[PDB]
Amino acid sequence: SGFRKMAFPSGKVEGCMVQVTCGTTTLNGLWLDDVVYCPRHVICTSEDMLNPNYEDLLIRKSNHNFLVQAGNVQLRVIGHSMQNCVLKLKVDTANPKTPKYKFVRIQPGQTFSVLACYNGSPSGVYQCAMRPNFTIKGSFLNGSCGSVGFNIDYDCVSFCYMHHMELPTGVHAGTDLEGNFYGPFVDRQTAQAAGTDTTITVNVLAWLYAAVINGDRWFLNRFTTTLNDFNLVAMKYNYEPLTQDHVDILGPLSAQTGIAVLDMCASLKELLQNGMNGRTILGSALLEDEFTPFDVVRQCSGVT
Amino acid sequence: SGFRKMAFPSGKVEGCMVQVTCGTTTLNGLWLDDVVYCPRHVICTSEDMLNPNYEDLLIRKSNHNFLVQAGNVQLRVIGHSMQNCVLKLKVDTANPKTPKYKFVRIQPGQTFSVLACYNGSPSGVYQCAMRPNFTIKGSFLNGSCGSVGFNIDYDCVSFCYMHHMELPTGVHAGTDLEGNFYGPFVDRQTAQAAGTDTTITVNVLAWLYAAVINGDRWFLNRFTTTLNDFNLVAMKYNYEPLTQDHVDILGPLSAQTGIAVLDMCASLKELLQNGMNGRTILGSALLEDEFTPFDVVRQCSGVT
Ligand SMILES: COc1ccccc1OCCNC(=O)C1=CC=NC(=O)C1
Ligand SMILES: COc1ccccc1OCCNC(=O)C1=CC=NC(=O)C1
């Protein structure tokens, strides 16, 4: 028993991290097969970031201008191309530590592990959720760009995020591995509105099921609700509307605990309307939304 | 910016994990050089765990009874010995993935990463603190025994914990890598009192400094206090007494932010006496104590 904000083991991803330098800028790259992926803003200087013309900036660059180093060994760059906001540097050597991998675009509300890196070296790993507004609340300092987010299913790493920037509000924005930003964000040093965020309702319910499985039950009540009634409360408290697809994904947790999804919704409704009254759930004094129903089942079953 | 409960990258530890089977029991082992370390309770059966005679149980076992498998390859056991509550199985092959390592006994209040494993396979990584009462609030299910805790300083892994059991209260107990339990715990299936736990005051203060560095400042007030006055409040709220050694370790964070340690103590005093009033600090609605002053500096500076 016990419940933790668990990240995937980062080993398979550590073996892919490289340092990429272009001029005076150094950031992180991901070396998979004979390609290194990194944010295209590695080609920018301070004067450029306000509104860089990436096509023009990249034209002044040659294969030899991109310095790629994997630990202490230098990789030979034989090609370069820009795909959306990522640069793909073709190298003459396939990464011998390349795991089985996929590039996936995750949905808002889904979770993933981030391996924060500096100068191509891993510093730490933490579990994140892609906010409904497509930002992530990470921990990234100068030099962290090119750090990636991923999920792991047995031996396959599904890369879903590459870190590009911190918005003036202190939240983080990045792209999928094809360089498409999550959300409306552009890779420019400008004020960018991130939409209204909401709490991931299906994840809070999954976390309430994790609480019951692990022994924290004080919040269970004698009430039930309907999807319509619950959604009126979800609206008032900036929670995502619950759909039948969300109820269906909560099926296994409802079956395991014997607590019907709408009964758990009624517990969540009471917690939203009355707060915690100074109590905690799974060591938290707020409603946790960065655990999906899949995460809860995985952690509660011990999937390796 | 941003602050997360970050774990160390687990790669160096994943390459050491093995499965150890003895009879019908399977758990995790740590393969370093030509030795595999695992909890000695791998030799027990259900009837034994109420009060096992480990010396007698181990005498009925031979090198060939310990099945050690690293992924898909079987290791040949050429020796076995019990040191405190750990078994050391000598194997004929040194682990080629053995990183630089140390065995350390951490102090209560210190933090470490845990790589939860099942059947010798890593499932996840999370950051823990050794509670003042020598328990850890982990996430471990059946089969997790032998999972380890560690810290990493550049290329050196300092192994500090090996998981042995879950107490009837749902908290976790384990040993250092020499098999000495942290706390009063014994490896028996019996009710075991874990002492009164307290909140790690120096860690809460370090986390308040992390909050100021990252922009959450609402809790800063116009007051100051003394170590004596603060400790009277710490006593009332089951917080560890603050010492000058704790103030000294907070020095770098006090210097970076310009907020004197006793002024931060006065903010903490007001938060203990008045609560959060429905606000959050670094995404938490409670006072966080699982970040040491070293962790805060490391995460705020980007040490890899
Ligand atoms: C506004 O900056 C940008 C806009 C578009 C593109 C790149 C930008 O930044 C490049 C350098 N940024 C960093 O190294 C970070 C510093 C702190 N926190 C982070 O998450 C990243
Ligand atoms: C009371 O059990 C023991 C006492 C002494 C020694 C060993 C004991 O357990 C062996 C198996 N335990 C597990 O696999 C766990 C199940 C669930 N949670 C965990 O943290 C471990």
Of the residues B66, B99, B132, the one at which a domain ends: B99
Task: Please tell me the distance from the alpha carbon of residue B243 to that of residue B97, in angstroms, as a whole number.
Answer: 42
Is residue B148 a contact partner of residue B29, using CB atoms and an 8 Å limit? no
Of the residues B197, B225, B258, the one at which a domain ends: B197
Q: DSSP alpha helices (H): ranges in chain B?
A: 11-14, 54-59, 201-213, 227-236, 244-249, 251-257, 261-274, 293-301
Relative orientation angle of helices A201-213 and A293-301, to the nearest 10 degrees: 20
Residues B7 and B114 in one domain: yes
Distance of CA A11 to the CA centre of its chain: 17
Which numbered ligand comes closest to the C-alpha of B144? 2
Three-state DSSP at B24 gives: coil
List CB contacts (< 8 A) between B15 and chain A: 11
Q: Please report, for the domain that includes residue A187, its CATH number.
A: 2.40.10.10
Residue type, B140: F
Residues A286 and A204 in one domain: yes
Counts of helices then strands in chain B (DSSP H, E)? 8, 13
Phi then psi for residue A242, to 5 deg, are -80, 135
Residue of A112, A139, A167 to mutate for B, most B C-beta atoms under 10 A = A139
Task: Please tell me the distance from the alpha carbon of residue A107 to that of residue B57, in angstroms, as a whole number.
Answer: 53
A161 touches chain B (CB under 8 A): no
Residues A211 and A288 in one domain: yes
Q: List strand residue ranges (DSSP E) for A133-261, in order.
A: 148-153, 156-166, 172-175
Protein residue with least CA distance to atom 8, ligand 2:
B165
CB A165 less than 6 A from any atom of ligand 1: yes
List CB contacts (< 8 A) between B1 and chain A: 139-141, 166, 170
Inspect the interface and report whether the beta carbons of A126 and B5 lie closer than 8 Å: yes
Residues A118 and A190 in one domain: yes
Instruction: Specify the DSSP class assigned to residue A199.
Output: B
Task: Please tell me the distance from the alpha carbon of residue B294 to that of residue A65, in angstroms, as a whole number.
Answer: 37
- The pair of structure tokens assigned to A258 is 């014997």
Q: What is the largest CA-CA distance in chain A?
A: 69
* C-alpha closest to that of A7 among A250, A295, A213: A295
B50 touches chain A (CB under 8 A): no
Residues at CB less than 6 angstroms from ligand 2? B 41, 49, 140-145, 164-166, 172, 187-189
End-to-end CA, chain A: 16
Residues A105 and A5 in one domain: yes
Q: How many interchain CB pairs under 8 A, A with B?
A: 151
Q: Please give, one letter per residue, the 3-state secondary structure of A105-150.
A: CCCCCCEEEEEEEECCEEEEEEEEECCCCCCECCCCCCCCCCCEEE
Residues A210 and A256 in one domain: yes
Task: Please tell me the distance from the alpha carbon of residue B27 to that of residue B15, in angstroms, as a whole number.
Answer: 16
Resolution in A: 1.6
Three-state DSSP at B125 gives: strand
- The pair of structure tokens assigned to A75 is 């990789």
C-alpha A54 to ligand 1 mean position (Å):
16
**Domain interval for residue A242:** 198-301
Q: Which of A9, A115, A144 sits opposite B124 (nearest CB)?
A: A9
Residues B2 and B21 in one domain: no
End-to-end CA, chain B: 16
* C-alpha closest to that of B169 among B135, B145, B200: B135
Counting Cα atoms < 13 Å in the Cβ hemisphere of A32 gives: 17
Residues B189 and B143 in one domain: yes
Q: Which of A5, A122, A170 sits opposite B126 (nearest CB)?
A: A5
Protein residue with least CA distance to atom 11, ligand 1:
A142
Residues A170 and A189 in one domain: yes
Residues B173 and B268 in one domain: no
Sequential DSSP letters for B127-196: EEE--TTS-B-----TT-TT-EEEEEETTEEEEEEEEEEE-TTS-EEEE-TTSPBSSS--SSSS------
CB A229 less than 6 A from any atom of ligand 1: no
What residues of chain B, 119 to 148, have a C-beta less than 8 Å from chain A? 119, 121-126, 128, 137-144
Give B17's contacts (C-beta < 8 A, 6+ positions apart): B28, B29, B30, B31, B70, B115, B117, B120, B121, B122
Determination method here? X-ray
- The pair of structure tokens assigned to A72 is 């202490």
Is residue B124 a contact partner of residue B14, using CB atoms and an 8 Å limit? no
Which numbered ligand comes closest to the C-alpha of B168? 2
Q: DSSP alpha helices (H): ranges in A60-111?
A: none
The chain B residue lying nearest A126, using CA atoms, is B6
Q: Please report, for the domain that includes residue B235, its CATH number.
A: 1.10.1840.10
Total domains, chain B: 3
List CB contacts (< 8 A) between A3 and chain B: 139
User: What separation in angstroms does the CA of A265 have from each of A198, A207, A230, A273, B256?
Assistant: 17, 12, 7, 12, 45
Residues B3 and B117 in one domain: yes
List CB contacts (< 8 A) between B10 and chain A: 9-11, 125
Residues A4 and A120 in one domain: yes
- The pair of structure tokens assigned to B302 is 């980007």
For this structure, is B163 an active site residue? no
Give B224's contacts (C-beta < 8 A, 6+ positions apart): B260, B262, B263, B265, B266
CA distance B205 to chain A (A): 19
Of the residues A73, A99, A125, the one at which a domain ends: A99
Q: Which of B125, B276, B278 sits opposite A9 (nearest CB)?
A: B125
* C-alpha closest to that of B145 among B108, B172, B124, B105: B172
Is residue A259 a contact partner of residue A205, using CB atoms and an 8 Å limit? no
Give A264's contacts (C-beta < 8 A, 6+ positions apart): A205, A208, A209, A250, A254
Task: Please tell me the distance from the alpha carbon of residue A23 to that of residue B179, in angstroms, as a whole number.
Answer: 52
C-alpha A88 to ligand 2 mean position (Å):
48
Give A274's contacts (C-beta < 8 A, 6+ positions apart): none
B256 touches chain A (CB under 8 A): no
User: Ligand 1, from A44, A48, A87, A145: best to mutate by most atoms within 8 Å of Cβ?
Assistant: A145
Hey, CA dihedral for A246, A248, A249, A253, is it positive or negative?
A: positive
Instruction: Specify the DSSP class assigned to residue A63.
Output: G
For this structure, is A41 an active site residue? yes
Residue type, A130: M
Task: Please tell me the distance from the alpha carbon of residue B258 to that of residue B212, in angstroms, as a whole number.
Answer: 10
